[PDB]
Amino acid sequence: PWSGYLDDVSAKFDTGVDNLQTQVTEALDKLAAKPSDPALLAAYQSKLSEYNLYRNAQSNTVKVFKDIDAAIIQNFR
Amino acid sequence: PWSGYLDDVSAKFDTGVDNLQTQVTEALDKLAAKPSDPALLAAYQSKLSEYNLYRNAQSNTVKVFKDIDAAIIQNFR
Amino acid sequence: SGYLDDVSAKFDTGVDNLQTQVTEALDKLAAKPSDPALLAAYQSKLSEYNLYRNAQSNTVKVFKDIDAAIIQNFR
Amino acid sequence: TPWSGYLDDNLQTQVTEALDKLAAKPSDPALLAAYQSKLSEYNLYRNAQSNTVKVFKDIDAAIIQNFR
Amino acid sequence: ATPWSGYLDDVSAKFDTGVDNLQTQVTEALDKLAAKPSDPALLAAYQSKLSEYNLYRNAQSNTVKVFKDIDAAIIQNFR
Amino acid sequence: SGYLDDVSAKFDTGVDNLQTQVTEALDKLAAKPSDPALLAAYQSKLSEYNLYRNAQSNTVKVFKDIDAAIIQNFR
Amino acid sequence: SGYLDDVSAKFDTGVDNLQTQVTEALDKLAAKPSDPALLAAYQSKLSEYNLYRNAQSNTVKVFKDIDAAIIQNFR
Amino acid sequence: NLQTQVTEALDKLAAKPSDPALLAAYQSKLSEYNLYRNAQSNTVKVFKDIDAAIIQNFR
Amino acid sequence: SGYLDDVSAKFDTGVDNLQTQVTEALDKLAAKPSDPALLAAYQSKLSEYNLYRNAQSNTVKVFKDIDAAIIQNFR
Amino acid sequence: DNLQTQVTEALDKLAAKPSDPALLAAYQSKLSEYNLYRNAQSNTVKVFKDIDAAIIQNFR
Amino acid sequence: WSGYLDDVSAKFDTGVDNLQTQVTEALDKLAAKPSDPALLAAYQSKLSEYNLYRNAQSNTVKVFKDIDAAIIQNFR
Amino acid sequence: SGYLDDVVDNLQTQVTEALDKLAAKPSDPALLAAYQSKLSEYNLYRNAQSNTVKVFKDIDAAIIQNFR
Amino acid sequence: YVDMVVNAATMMDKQNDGIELGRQKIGVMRLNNTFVGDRTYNLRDQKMVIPGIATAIERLLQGEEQPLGNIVSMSLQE
Amino acid sequence: YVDMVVNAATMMDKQNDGIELGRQKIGVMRLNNTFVGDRTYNLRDQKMVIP
Amino acid sequence: IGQAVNIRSMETDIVSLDDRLLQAFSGSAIATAVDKQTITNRIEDPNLVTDPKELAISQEMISDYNLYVSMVSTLTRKGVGAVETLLRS
Amino acid sequence: VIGQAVNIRSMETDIVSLDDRLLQAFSGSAIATAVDKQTITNRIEDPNLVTDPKELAISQEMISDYNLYVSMVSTLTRKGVGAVETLLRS
Amino acid sequence: VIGQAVNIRSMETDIVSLDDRLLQAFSGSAIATAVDKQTITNRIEDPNLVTDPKELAISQEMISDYNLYVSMVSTLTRKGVGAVETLLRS
Amino acid sequence: VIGQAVNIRSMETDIVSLDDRLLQAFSGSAIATAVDKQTITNRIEDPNLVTDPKELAISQEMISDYNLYVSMVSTLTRKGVGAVETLLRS
Known part of the structure; x- marks a missing residue:
């Protein structure tokens, strides 16, 4: 078991949004029972949007560091 | 059977609304026998509109999770 | 068959039956294009088929690159 | 090769494991986010290695060719 | 203590030469694809086979090249 | 004519009538641009033609690389 | 030590604090991934980093090749 | 020879650069021509290096 | 003169008027940006011009490479 | 020195308006031709004087 | 006191008389009122023109360094 | 140097100065574009010098060997 | 004698790379006590599925690498 | 003797890589006191599921 | 495909130098x-x-030719090199 | 690790000619x-x-070692015969 | 700065044999x-x-310095041997 | 093609001595x-x-043939002079 650096960059986001990963599935499990409640719709719109942004920013950030590292390693020649 | 994450997020709504998928048909075939009874009309209105919201919210949720996945898979390359 | 064929076949073995399910659902829908319950199922199945093929292709490409970059160094 | 008489693999398994988890449910965002990182690190590792092994070959060859 | 000599399969390789499976399969897969260029199940297969054929052919060429440079460098060392 | 011409012509013969089917269906559509039957018929043909041309060109490209990489090692 | 480390260091004494700032901005953003005020700052800092590291590495490569040429002409 | 075939494919293309059928034909012709020229030049060089090496050997 | 100039000029003579068909169709459109027949006319001319220039450049590039690879073997 | 003059003319016209595609298209060609010319000349000069040096080394 | 690749860069820098300042000016004006379409339309042109200027300059100096290095290699 | 012992400025200075200025702000296009051409001209100068020194020494070695 | 033996044997072994042993066979088996196909029971509250033997077995074996043996409730050729 | 033993041993080993013996077996196990499948129950305002 | 072989090509006895x-x-x-x-x-x-399968053959043929002529040249030069030293000395 | 052997004892020099x-x-x-x-x-x-990327990383080392071994032997033998030439021809 | 040591008066009243x-x-x-x-x-x-970019940027310098050092030692050694050959060789 | 001429008759001479x-x-x-x-x-x-690729493909050959021819004439001349020198020294 060996954590690299990219793993740490990712985990920074996971340990940032401490509970959002549960809140999304719990708000879904509320809503699916009674889809017509405005309070529940208003809640789930928010938590879903947040979860989208979080996963997107995480993946872009990992890609940029992958591209810096490759560009350095190509100069070892 | 085999079932992906999206299939799961879909089935959550099915198993959420226990019986509505039947009730809209039984209310319909009661009403069709006697279109002029207020007590049948007033029920059918609420059941049909609940079924409507149900299908819409299900389809939009599956669409959003698809697009989060496609966004991540675009970065493997 | 090499190692790429094996990587490729891992996806095809991981999804038990999707290639069949998607076709069947298509045939059920084509008979009755207007039943919401036939329609919602097909939406999900087709959606998953899409992702499966995309991931499978991008992975093979990455492994190819790692190999060609090694083989450049033999000489 | 050892200098005669002188006193004085996990990443591969980790990538294999993550691939096997992902292949079972290609639509899980958490399995995707994990695999992206494992594959990126493995790629960088293999490249840095093979470049270094060439650099040492070419130094030994230059030494021999200097006296040859 | 010394490592073992090994033992030599002198006859086998030179007459093990013969039509490779790999080229045969590449040409067969291409002929299947060209019949229906839009089937994803066939495209997925051909991507993989063509890739493997690319790697194999390069690895082989670079190896022949290395083995013959050694011999040219020996002869040029003695003349 | 070399080997690359052969690889191209395998696609040309693999699709029998597509080029003329496309040319035809376009002229039927252009005669009555507002008929849904003709529109539906045309979309599929043009899509097929697009994929055909792309696959053909990418394959010729790959083979060129394998050949140039071998020829480089004659020296 | 050496001159190529002197060239490498002439960058790191040039960008006083960037190495810290980037990680600090990352921690803030990770705390609230959806604040546009944070996002806008991180984009800048990350770009300035990417550029600094590329310019450094290519310069070290060039001075290495100048010295490797001279040490061959010693012969 | 190949020289003329390539020259003529070019002349037909430049008449209508937007025709896919012409483009596909040209890609193929220009590719084969490129490979031919390279292979020829490398072989010529190899034979001349051998010839020179013999003289350098007895010199 | 030179040979790459002949290759490049062969396109210019292949398309007789295009370099100033574009400039004229632009001058016409700029007078009445909202006329759909003018918009539809301009779209095709500008597309044609785009392709013309791309093909012209890439061909000169390929011929350059073939010449440089031959001249490399004079030594 | 004709092909030396042509390239410096082309460069001035281009530098006057770096975004004009007709000028760019012309300059690409002129620069490529000049680039091949220089290499060919230098390589043959080298060959011609390596032959003289090998003659002298033969009797030396 | 300078070489010939500086003469070649300076032919661009004196060729596009003023663009180098015009860009900064345009940005100073747009920053004050981002929602103005006339300013936006002007800035798009200046920024694109500047992007091409810099690319053409750098690729030309690269090519002349490749010619020179090859001639020097033959001094052997 | 500040020193003369009784009995303009060169590319070596100009490069060191342009690198020094650049390293203060690695992301300014004017400075980058000013530095590319100085680093290129310094690379060319420093190759051409060494190659010609090498030619003059091989000439003198051949003379001494010819009279051995 | 030694040379002949060694050569002959090596060629026999190589040529037998063109022969094939693994001819497939087909068994047809009628079920006496149950329906072959899978079934779905649309409970008024829930849809539930009972898979068929074919589905169950395929799902079980899918992706296996090793042989089978000992189903429970010359040597070179074998 | 030594040269024969060492060679025959090494070759037998290389050949045995082709032999495979970890063959799988199948066992059917009936349940006598419980249902095989997953079960779902409705609570006050949410479902409960037992795997 | 048109091929011929000449079989009775050589004499294996001891023969004049x-x-x-x-x-x-x-x-x-x-x-x-x-x-x-x-x-x-x-x-x-x-x-x-x-054809990539044909080019791979041509590569081997070229290399084998190169080596064969290099070796015949080297051994012939050392052959006359022996005689000239025994005679000069 | 699949099959290995080593030679433990080397014969005495007292019975073997040069x-x-x-x-x-x-x-x-x-x-x-x-x-x-x-x-x-x-x-x-x-x-x-x-x-397989794992296996290629091995092949690259194997070919680099073969190349260095043969270059070494071919150099030292040439030095060896050059000594005999120097002593006898001179 | 870590574990620095220097010898003094290395040749002041003792001299090594070559x-x-x-x-x-x-x-x-x-x-x-x-x-x-x-x-x-x-x-x-x-x-x-x-x-990690910070650690890769350090490793590039180590590889560069190793390669330059071994090349310089090899060249000087070869050149110095040549002079003794030109001295002894009749 | 344009402005082209060839000499049909070569002048001739007697050849009577080495x-x-x-x-x-x-x-x-x-x-x-x-x-x-x-x-x-x-x-x-x-x-x-x-x-032009076709013309460059020719110039390559012309250069090669020139190199080979002048190297041959140099070698055989030096061999002849060396044979004379060897016999007269002996």
């Missing part, structure tokens, strides 16, 4: 002449210069 | 070499070995 | 080299060092 | 060499010929 030269020289000059010809007409044929 | 020790050294080197060349060739053809 | 001067030079060089090769290999193996 | 056979072989080679060198120089500076 003068003719072992002629027979070696002639057999070698013949082999190299035909080898070189086949190389060149493999490059001129468009169906062979563009 | 040229036997040479024949015996030469033969051993020539065989270990032909065996390495063959091994590499076979690795390049097994499609599993030629397309 | 026989020893060569031997000390050889030993002090050979061990430094072998330790630098191990350091590089270890910096490549550790997953946390091959994935 | 002296004249030698001067004749010398003069025959000198001129062929000068002509070839000039031809190549022109082919390197007509811009229709420097930049």
Whole structure:
């Protein structure tokens, strides 16, 4: 078991949004029972949007560091 | 059977609304026998509109999770 | 068959039956294009088929690159 | 090769494991986010290695060719 | 203590030469694809086979090249 | 004519009538641009033609690389 | 030590604090991934980093090749 | 020879650069021509290096 | 003169008027940006011009490479 | 020195308006031709004087 | 006191008389009122023109360094 | 140097100065574009010098060997 | 004698790379006590599925690498 | 003797890589006191599921 | 496909030293002449210069030719090099 | 780790002539070499070995070691005969 | 700055024979080299060092310095041997 | 094609002694060499010929043939003079 650096960059986001990963599935499990409640719709719109942004920013950030590292390693020649 | 994450997020709504998928048909075939009874009309209105919201919210949720996945898979390359 | 064929076949073995399910659902829908319950199922199945093929292709490409970059160094 | 008489693999398994988890449910965002990182690190590792092994070959060859 | 000599399969390789499976399969897969260029199940297969054929052919060429440079460098060392 | 011409012509013969089917269906559509039957018929043909041309060109490209990489090692 | 480390260091004494700032901005953003005020700052800092590291590495490569040429002409 | 075939494919293309059928034909012709020229030049060089090496050997 | 100039000029003579068909169709459109027949006319001319220039450049590039690879073997 | 003059003319016209595609298209060609010319000349000069040096080394 | 690749860069820098300042000016004006379409339309042109200027300059100096290095290699 | 012992400025200075200025702000296009051409001209100068020194020494070695 | 033996044997072994042993066979088996196909029971509250033997077995074996043996409730050729 | 033993041993080993013996077996196990499948129950305002 | 082989080519007894030269020289000059010809007409044929399975063969043929001529040259030079030292000394 | 052997005892010098020790050294080197060349060739053809990143990283080392070994032997033998030329011709 | 040490008066009232001067030079060089090769290999193996820009930028300098040092020692040695050959060789 | 001419009849001479056979072989080679060198120089500076693949493919051969021919004449001349020197020294 060996954590690299990219793993740490990712985990920074996971340990940032401490509970959002549960809140999304719990708000879904509320809503699916009674889809017509405005309070529940208003809640789930928010938590879903947040979860989208979080996963997107995480993946872009990992890609940029992958591209810096490759560009350095190509100069070892 | 085999079932992906999206299939799961879909089935959550099915198993959420226990019986509505039947009730809209039984209310319909009661009403069709006697279109002029207020007590049948007033029920059918609420059941049909609940079924409507149900299908819409299900389809939009599956669409959003698809697009989060496609966004991540675009970065493997 | 090499190692790429094996990587490729891992996806095809991981999804038990999707290639069949998607076709069947298509045939059920084509008979009755207007039943919401036939329609919602097909939406999900087709959606998953899409992702499966995309991931499978991008992975093979990455492994190819790692190999060609090694083989450049033999000489 | 050892200098005669002188006193004085996990990443591969980790990538294999993550691939096997992902292949079972290609639509899980958490399995995707994990695999992206494992594959990126493995790629960088293999490249840095093979470049270094060439650099040492070419130094030994230059030494021999200097006296040859 | 010394490592073992090994033992030599002198006859086998030179007459093990013969039509490779790999080229045969590449040409067969291409002929299947060209019949229906839009089937994803066939495209997925051909991507993989063509890739493997690319790697194999390069690895082989670079190896022949290395083995013959050694011999040219020996002869040029003695003349 | 070399080997690359052969690889191209395998696609040309693999699709029998597509080029003329496309040319035809376009002229039927252009005669009555507002008929849904003709529109539906045309979309599929043009899509097929697009994929055909792309696959053909990418394959010729790959083979060129394998050949140039071998020829480089004659020296 | 050496001159190529002197060239490498002439960058790191040039960008006083960037190495810290980037990680600090990352921690803030990770705390609230959806604040546009944070996002806008991180984009800048990350770009300035990417550029600094590329310019450094290519310069070290060039001075290495100048010295490797001279040490061959010693012969 | 190949020289003329390539020259003529070019002349037909430049008449209508937007025709896919012409483009596909040209890609193929220009590719084969490129490979031919390279292979020829490398072989010529190899034979001349051998010839020179013999003289350098007895010199 | 030179040979790459002949290759490049062969396109210019292949398309007789295009370099100033574009400039004229632009001058016409700029007078009445909202006329759909003018918009539809301009779209095709500008597309044609785009392709013309791309093909012209890439061909000169390929011929350059073939010449440089031959001249490399004079030594 | 004709092909030396042509390239410096082309460069001035281009530098006057770096975004004009007709000028760019012309300059690409002129620069490529000049680039091949220089290499060919230098390589043959080298060959011609390596032959003289090998003659002298033969009797030396 | 300078070489010939500086003469070649300076032919661009004196060729596009003023663009180098015009860009900064345009940005100073747009920053004050981002929602103005006339300013936006002007800035798009200046920024694109500047992007091409810099690319053409750098690729030309690269090519002349490749010619020179090859001639020097033959001094052997 | 500040020193003369009784009995303009060169590319070596100009490069060191342009690198020094650049390293203060690695992301300014004017400075980058000013530095590319100085680093290129310094690379060319420093190759051409060494190659010609090498030619003059091989000439003198051949003379001494010819009279051995 | 030694040379002949060694050569002959090596060629026999190589040529037998063109022969094939693994001819497939087909068994047809009628079920006496149950329906072959899978079934779905649309409970008024829930849809539930009972898979068929074919589905169950395929799902079980899918992706296996090793042989089978000992189903429970010359040597070179074998 | 030594040269024969060492060679025959090494070759037998290389050949045995082709032999495979970890063959799988199948066992059917009936349940006598419980249902095989997953079960779902409705609570006050949410479902409960037992795997 | 049109192929021929000459079978009864050589005499294996002990034979005068003068003719072992002629027979070696002639057999070698013949082999190299035909080898070189086949190389060149493999490059001129468009169906062979563009097939990746054929190019891999031409690469081997070229290299084998290079090595064979390098070795015949080297050994002949050392052969006359022996005689000239024994005689001068 | 699949199959391995080692030679434990080397024969006494008291019973072996000077040229036997040479024949015996030469033969051993020539065989270990032909065996390495063959091994590499076979690795390049097994499609599993030629397309797996793990296995290629091994093939690259094997070919670099073969190259250095043969360059070493071919250099030291040339120095060895050059000494004999220097003493006898001179 | 870590563990610095310097010898003083190295030649002030004692002088080594050339026989020893060569031997000390050889030993002090050979061990430094072998330790630098191990350091590089270890910096490549550790997953946390091959994935961080700060650590890669350090490793590029180590590889560059090793390559330049070994090339300079080899060239000077060859050139110095040549002079003794030109002296002794009749 | 345009403005082209060929000399049909060569002037002729008697050849009666080894002296004249030698001067004749010398003069025959000198001129062929000068002509070839000039031809190549022109082919390197007509811009229709420097930049066309078909013409470059020819110039390559002309350069090679020149190199080989002059190296042969040099070698055989030096061998002949060395044989004379060896016999007279002996």
